Design a protein around this nucleic acid. Structure first.
Ligand SMILES: Nc1ncnc2c1ncn2[C@@H]1O[C@H](COP(=O)(O)OP(=O)(O)NP(=O)(O)O)[C@@H](O)[C@H]1O
Ligand SMILES: Nc1ncnc2c1ncn2[C@@H]1O[C@H](COP(=O)(O)OP(=O)(O)NP(=O)(O)O)[C@@H](O)[C@H]1O
Ligand SMILES: [Mg+2]
Ligand SMILES: [Mg+2]
Ligand SMILES: [Mg+2]
Ligand SMILES: [Zn+2]
Lengths: 550, 230, 48
RNA sequence: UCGGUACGGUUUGUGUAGGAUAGGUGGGAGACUGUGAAACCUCGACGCCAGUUGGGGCGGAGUCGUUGUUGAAAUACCAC
C-alpha cells in the first residue's frame, strides 16, 4: 500500500544535526521532486531509502517485495569493461545465472545424469521469471537509447562525462519499484536530458529526483518535497503550483518573524536593566525570554560568505594562441583546423555535446596533453588554473584542510602569504568543519572544494570546467557575480543554457555534420547572438527510444 | 460485428455464478454457429507474485483428451529415439535438426529430448524457449522416460503458468465434445491449483474466475463449487 | 560534548560497559578489547 | 455539482528492419461482403513515420484479412 514509510527519523551527529523528525510516507507511482538549499539533507534522505545507511532513531521501512535503486551524487563503477557496466546491477540476477545454465548442460555422464532435473530445470524456472533470457539482442536495446560509448573499451580516462550515461544504464535496467535518482542531469547534453525527460514520464514505479530542471518538475512530478535544514515538509502539485503557495507562505512568514524580533528587543531591557521591578516572580517571567530566544536561534541562518576569486599578476596582451591545431586519436576525429586567440578580460564559453572533446582542449593549454599536428603558444605572462571535470584532485580519505593546504601553514595564492586555514573558510568551511573527510561532503561542498585546490595560484587564466553542478541559486548567483569582477580570461565549459546567457563574451562551439565531424566555430559576442547567427548560416537550426520492450 | 455472436450474450446471466454443468451448455450453443473451438479457463489469484515464493505451476491429466494436432519433435540418437519412434511421432529428428530448425523450417509443435543431448538442445532452446517449448524436467518431454514420452502428448499433460497479473490460462476441451467430456477435465484443474496452494497468500484465495471459448463471450463461474463438478 | 556511550560485544551483542568519550575529537565508534563475562574471554566492543 | 468504492461496455501504447509488435499472457483459420472514396475526414485515442476496419447519412458489388515473411513476436479474433 505504501512503498516506503518513515517513523520519527533523526539521522544526525549530536553536535550538528542533518535530519530531524522526518515523518512522511509515499505511494506507488509517486513521482516526487525534491528541492532545497545546500546543507539541508536531500541526499541523506535518498541514502536511507536505498539501505546504504541507517538512522540514529526511527524506523525506515521499505515495502515487502519492492526493490529500490539508487544513483548517488558521485556515481561509482567498476574497472573492468563497458558491457560489464550493464551486468553488475540491472541484469545481474539473470546474467550471472545465464552462463551456469550453459555450464550445467555440458553433458557430463560419469558425474551425474538425473540430477539435471532439480538444478537445470530449476535454472529453467528462474529464466521464466524475467520473461526474456536471450539477453543479447535486448542489450543493444539498452545502449542504443542512452547513446552509450562503444561497448568494448574500459572506463579509464577513456570516458568523460558520459560516465553518467553508463550509470544511467546500470540503474534504469533493474527497473526498481522505488527509483532514487539523485541529480541525474549532471554533465548531460541538450538532448541527453531530453531523452531522460520522456523516459521518466511514462515510467511505472515511484520516482524521487533531486533535480533542478523544469520539464520534470512541472509535468512529471505530482508531489514536491521541500527539505528545510533538518526539517522535511511535503506538498502537493507540480512546481508551478509549489512556488505560488511557497510565495504567499514566505510572505506571512516574513512578518511573522519581524514582530517576533521586535518582541525580543522590547523585553530585552525588561529582563536586563532595572531588576528592582518585581521580587520572587522574576524567575517565572525570565524563562519566557529564554523560551523565545532559543527558538529565535533555530531559524537565524543568514550567514552566507561570498565566493571570491583572488587576483594576482597583470595580464598582458596575448593569452592563448592556437596555431592551426589538430587533435585526435587512432581513427577518431575530434578538433581539426582550429585557430583562435583568447581575449584579455573576457568570459569565454564552450559549447558542445558529450563526446566532442571539450575538456581535452583545456588539457592542451595547461600541459597535460600534447597536440598532434599543431602548437599552442602560452605567453610568458599568464598563469594557469585548471579545475577538472571529473574532480580528480579529491582524495576521499584525508580531511578537507589536508586536500587544499597539503598540511602546510601558509600557501602561495595571490603573491602574498595567506594563512592557509583562512583560505579554507573563504570558500565556506567555518572552523571545526575542516575536520571531516572529503569523501562524504555535500554536492555543494565538493564543488566548494574543487574551486579551492584549483584557484590556489591566483592565476589570470582560469579554466572552469562544469562549474554549474550541484550548487543552488544563492551560490550560482554568487559565482556569476564574482567572475564578472575578475580582471581577465575566465574560460568556461558549460551545459546550463541559462548560465551562458548570463555571463559570456565569446563562444567556441562545435557545428559538425556528415562532411567532417571535427569543426570548431569561433564567435565574437554573447550567447544571445550565437543562437541567432546559427540559424542564418546553417540549416540544422525526438523519436524516442524505448530502452526496453515496454 | 455479428448478431449470432451477440445472440448468446442474453444466454449468459450477469450476477449468477453458474455450475460446470450449466457452463458447457453455452459452449454447445455458441461454438455450433461456426467451426470447432476450444474452451478457455481464466482464474484470478489472491497472491502477491512479485516475490519468487509464490510462482505456481503444476501438471494435469486429461481422461477425455485434448483435441490437439500435437506435432511431435524428437531430439535423440541411438536407442533413446528407438523406444519412442514407434510411439507415434510424426517428425522424428536427430542431431541434424540443429540446422533445419533455425534455418527456417519451424514446422513442429512439441519437443521431446533426452538428458544426453543438452549440449545441443541448449542452442536450440534459445528460440524455442521463449516460444514456450523449453525443455521440461517435470512432465516427461525431457527425462529418462524415452518410452512413454510421445504418448503423453496424446495423454493430456499441459502445464499452467501464472503471470505477474495473477491470471491462469488452461484449455480444457474442444467444441464437438459434450458436457460430460469436460467435468473430469475441469474438476482436476482447480485441484491442481490447490496442489500448488501458497502458504503466504492473504484474503480470499480465488476471488474471480471465468470460463469461455475462442469465439464465445464471458460466463460467470462459482468459486464455491469443489465437489459437484459432474 | 562528553556523552555517555555504552559498549557492546561483537558476537553476543551484550552491553557490558558504559564510559565517556569526546565527540569532536572522536567522531567514529570506539573499539576496545574488553572482558565479556558471558563468553569468558576478551572480545572486541564497538559502540551503539 | 465535486470526489472514493463496486460492476460493466468502449478506447488507449510508434528504437531500428517488415504495409506505424492492435500493450502482456493463453488459445485459434476466421470475418461475410460493413469497398472507403460524406462528415468532429483519415474510428474523432497518440496527432512524435502523416493513422490504430466501427456515432459509417454511395452501399448490400468488390472488404488492412488467410496467401507475403524482414523480425524475441508482426498479423484477422474474442475472453481474463
Ligand atoms: N583517454 C582517452 N583516450 C582516447 N580517447 C578518449 C579519451 N577520453 C575521451 N576520449 C574520446 O574523446 C571523446 C570526448 O572526450 P572527453 O574527454 O570526454 O571530452 P568531453 O567531450 O568534454 N567529455 P564531456 O565534457 O562530457 O562532453 C569521447 O567520446 C571519446 O571518444
Ligand atoms: N556523514 C556526514 N557527517 C556529517 N555531516 C554530513 C555527513 N553527510 C553529509 N553531511 C552534511 O549534512 C548536510 C546534508 O547534505 P547532503 O544530503 O549530504 O547533500 P545536500 O547538500 O543536502 N544536497 P546537495 O546540496 O545537492 O548535495 C550537508 O551539509 C553535508 O555536508
Ligand atoms: Mg546532493
Ligand atoms: Mg569532458
Ligand atoms: Mg586521536
Ligand atoms: Zn561476548
Amino acid at each position: 500500500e505504501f512503498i516506503y514509510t518513515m517513523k520519527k527519523v533523526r539521522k544526525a551527529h549530536g553536535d550538528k544535526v542533518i535530519l530531524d523528525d522526518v515523518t512522511l510516507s509515499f505511494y506507488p507511482g509517486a513521482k516526487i521532486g525534491v528541492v532545497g538549499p545546500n546543507g539541508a539533507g536531500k541526499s541523506s534522505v535518498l541514502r536511507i531509502m536505498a539501505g546504504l545507511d541507517k538512522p540514529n532513531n526511527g524506523d525506515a521501512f521499505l515495502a515487502t517485495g519492492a526493490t529500490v535503486g539508487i544513483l548517488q551524487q558521485e556515481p561509482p563503477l567498476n574497472e573492468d569493461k563497458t558491457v560489464r557496466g550493464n551486468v553488475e546491477e540491472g541484469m545481474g540476477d539473470i546474467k550471472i545465472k545465464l552462463d551456469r545454465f550453459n555450464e550445467v548442460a555440458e553433458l557430463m555422464a560419469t558425474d551425474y545424469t538425473d540430477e539435471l532435473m532439480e538444478e537445470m530445470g530449476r535454472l529453467q524456472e528462474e529464466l521464466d521469471h524475467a520473461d526474456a533470457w536471450d539477453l543479447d539482442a535486448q542489450l543493444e536495446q539498452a545502449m542504443d537509447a542512452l547513446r552509450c560509448p562503444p561497448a568494448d573499451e574500459p572506463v579509464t580516462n577513456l570516458s568523460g562525462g558520459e560516465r553518467r550515461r553508463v550509470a544511467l544504464c546500470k540503474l534504469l535496467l533493474s527497473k526498481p519499484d522505488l527509483l532514487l535518482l539523485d541529480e541525474p542531469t549532471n554533465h548531460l547534453d541538450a538532448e541527453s536530458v531530453q531523452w531522460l525527460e520522456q523516459h521518466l514520464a511514462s515510467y511505472p514505479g515511484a520516482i524521487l529526483a533531486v533535480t533542478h530542471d523544469r520539464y520534470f518538475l512541472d509535468n512529471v512530478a505530482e508531489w514536491i518535497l521541500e527539505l528545510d535544514r533538518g526539517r522535511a515538509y511535503p506538498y502537493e502539485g507540480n512546481y508551478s503550483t509549489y512556488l505560488e503557495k511557497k510565495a504567499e507562505r514566505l510572505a506571512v512568514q516574513g512578518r511573522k518573524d519581524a514582530k517576533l524580533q521586535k518582541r525580543l528587543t522590547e523585553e530585552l531591557a525588561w529582563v536586563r536593566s532595572g531588576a528592582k521591578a518585581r521580587q520572587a516572580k522574576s524567575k517565572a517571567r525570565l524563562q519566557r525570554y529564554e523560551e523565545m530566544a532559543a527558538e529565535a536561534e533555530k531559524t537565524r541562518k543568514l550567514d552566507f560568505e561570498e565566493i571570491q576569486i583572488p587576483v594576482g599578476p597583470r595580464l598582458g596582451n596575448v593569452v592563448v594562441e592556437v596555431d592551426h591545431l589538430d587533435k585526435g586519436y587512432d581513427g577518431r576525429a575530434l578538433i581539426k583546423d582550429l585557430s583562435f586567440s583568447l581575449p584579455r578580460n573576457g568570459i569565454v564559453g564552450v559549447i558542445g555535446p558529450n563526446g566532442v572533446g571539450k575538456t581535452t582542449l583545456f588539457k592542451t593549454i595547461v600541459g597535460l596533453e600534447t597536440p598532434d599536428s599543431g602548437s599552442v603558444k602560452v605567453g610568458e605572462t599568464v598563469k594557469l588554473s585548471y579545475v577538472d571535470q571529473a574532480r580528480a584532485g579529491i582524495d576521499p580519505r584525508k580531511t578537507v584542510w589536508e586536500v587544499v593546504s597539503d598540511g602546510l601553514d601558509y600557501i602561495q595564492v595571490g603573491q602574498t602569504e595567506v594563512p592557509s586555514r583562512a583560505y579554507v573558510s573563504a570558500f565556506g568551511f567555518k572552523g571545526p568543519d575542516q575536520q571531516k573527510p572529503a569523501g562524504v561532503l555535500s554536492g555543494g561542498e565538493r564543488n566548494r572544494l574543487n574551486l579551492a585546490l584549483t584557484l590556489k595560484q591566483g592565476g589570470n587564466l582560469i579554466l572552469l570546467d562544469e562549474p554549474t553542478n550541484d550548487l543552488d541559486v544563492e551560490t550560482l548567483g554568487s559565482l556569476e557575480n564574482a567572475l564578472l569582477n575578475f580582471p581577465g580570461c575566465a574560460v568556461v565549459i558549460s551545459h546550463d543554457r541559462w548560465f551562458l546567457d548570463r555571463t559570456c563574451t565569446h563562444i567556441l562551439a562545435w557545428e559538425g555534420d556528415d562532411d567532417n565531424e571535427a569543426k570548431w566555430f569561433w564567435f565574437e559576442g554573447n550567447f544571445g547572438a550565437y543562437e541567432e547567427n546559427k540559424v542564418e548560416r546553417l540549416g540544422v537550426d525526438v523519436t524516442h527510444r524505448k530502452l526496453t520492450r515496454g | 460485428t455479428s448478431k449470432a455472436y451477440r445472440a448468446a450474450a442474453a444466454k449468459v446471466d450477469r450476477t449468477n455464478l453458474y455450475t460446470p454443468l450449466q457452463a458447457a451448455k453455452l459452449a454447445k450453443e455458441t461454438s455450433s454457429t461456426k467451426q470447432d473451438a476450444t474452451v478457455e479457463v481464466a482464474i484470478r489469484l489472491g497472491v502477491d507474485p512479485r516475490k519468487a515464493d509464490q510462482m505456481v505451476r503444476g501438471t494435469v491429466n486429461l481422461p477425455h483428451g485434448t483435441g490437439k494436432t500435437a506435432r511431435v519433435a524428437v531430439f535423440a540418437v541411438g536407442e533413446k529415439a528407438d523406444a519412442a519412434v514407434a510411439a507415434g511421432a510424426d517428425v522424428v529428428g536427430s542431431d541434424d535438426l540443429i540446422e533445419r530448425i533455425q534455418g527456417g523450417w519451424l514446422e513442429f509443435d512439441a519437443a521431446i529430448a533426452t538428458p544426453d543431448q543438452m549440449a545441443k538442445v541448449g542452442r536450440i532452446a534459445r528460440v524455442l524457449g521463449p516460444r514456450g517449448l523449453m525443455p521440461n524436467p517435470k512432465t516427461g518431454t525431457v527425462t529418462a522416460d524415452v518410452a512413454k514420452a510421445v504418448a503423453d502428448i496424446k495423454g493430456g499433460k499441459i502445464n499452467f503458468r501464472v503471470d505477474k497479473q495473477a491470471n491462469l490460462h488452461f484449455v480444457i476441451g474442444k467444441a464437438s465434445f459434450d458436457e460430460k467430456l469436460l467435468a473430469e477435465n475441469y474438476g482436476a484443474a482447480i485441484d491442481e491449483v490447490l496442489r500448488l496452494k501458497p502458504s503466504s497468500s492473504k484474503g480470499r484465495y480465488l476471488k474471480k474466475i471465468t470460463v469461455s471459448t475462442t469465439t464465445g463471450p464471458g460466463i460467470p463461474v462459482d468459486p464455491s463449487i469443489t465437489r459437484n463438478f459432474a | 560534548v562528553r556523552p555517555k556511550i555504552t559498549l557492546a560485544c561483537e558476537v553476543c551483542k551484550h552491553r557490558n560497559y558504559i564510559t565517556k568519550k569526546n565527540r569532536r575529537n572522536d567522531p567514529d565508534r570506539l573499539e576496545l578489547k574488553k572482558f565479556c563475562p558471558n563468553c569468558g574471554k576478551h572480545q572486541a566492543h564497538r559502540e551503539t
